């Protein structure tokens, strides 16, 4: 889709640290909760991410749920150029 | 259904003309560079963007629209 890499980074970055994204199925929202971009940029970016593997999608009541996968982990590792064994949603926080 | 009504003359998209980009950086005498196409004074345009020269017109293209400078 058409969008500046500037907004691509906010998605690609936030997907790496938090490991999971949610998004209501309503384009024209103009600002995602928790992200700095238009809602539309999110949904179609993850859709692009999903269709080359890298992430699964669930819908269930008008809200996409996106699950970053293992094969995805290395891709945006490249795209964020962070080194091998940086992080994911894969941290047991302290003692919980 | 009722396919294909269409009185003629279909519409075209934009083209984005080729315009092999600026040598509009005239150097004078090896290599005093005189920098044609006066730049823009808005802090979002860090003076690297220039002003388009139409009639009654100096337009900042980097501002997708904003700020008509008049000279």
């Amino acid at each position: 889709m058409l969008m500046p890499k500037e907004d691509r980074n906010k998605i690609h970055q936030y997907l790496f640290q938090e490991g999971v994204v949610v998004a209501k199925k309503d384009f024209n929202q103009a600002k995602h909760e928790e992200i700095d971009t238009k809602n539309l940029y999110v949904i179609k970016a993850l859709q692009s991410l999903t269709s080359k593997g890298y992430v699964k999608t669930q819908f269930s009541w008008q809200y996409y749920y996106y699950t970053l996968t293992e094969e995805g982990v290395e891709y945006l590792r490249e795209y964020l150029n962070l080194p091998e064994h940086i992080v994911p949603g894969t941290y047991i926080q302290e003692r919980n | 259904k009722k396919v294909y009504t269409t009185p003629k003359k279909i519409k075209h998209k934009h083209k984005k003309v080729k315009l092999a980009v600026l040598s509009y950086y005239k150097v004078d005498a090896e290599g005093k560079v005189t920098k044609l196409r006066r730049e823009c004074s808005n802090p979002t345009c860090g003076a690297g963007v220039f002003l388009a020269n139409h009639k009654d017109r100096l337009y900042c293209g980097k501002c997708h629209s904003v700020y008509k400078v008049n000279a």
Partner: peptide
């Protein structure tokens, strides 16, 4: 296991010398 905690890796790799800034003539 699989350390360095990306949420804070931008905060440890937050050392400078990764930019440049100069403008404003005429």
């Amino acid at each position: 296991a699989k350390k360095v905690e990306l949420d804070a890796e931008r905060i440890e790799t937050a050392e400078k010398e990764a930019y440049v800034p100069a403008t404003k003539v005429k």
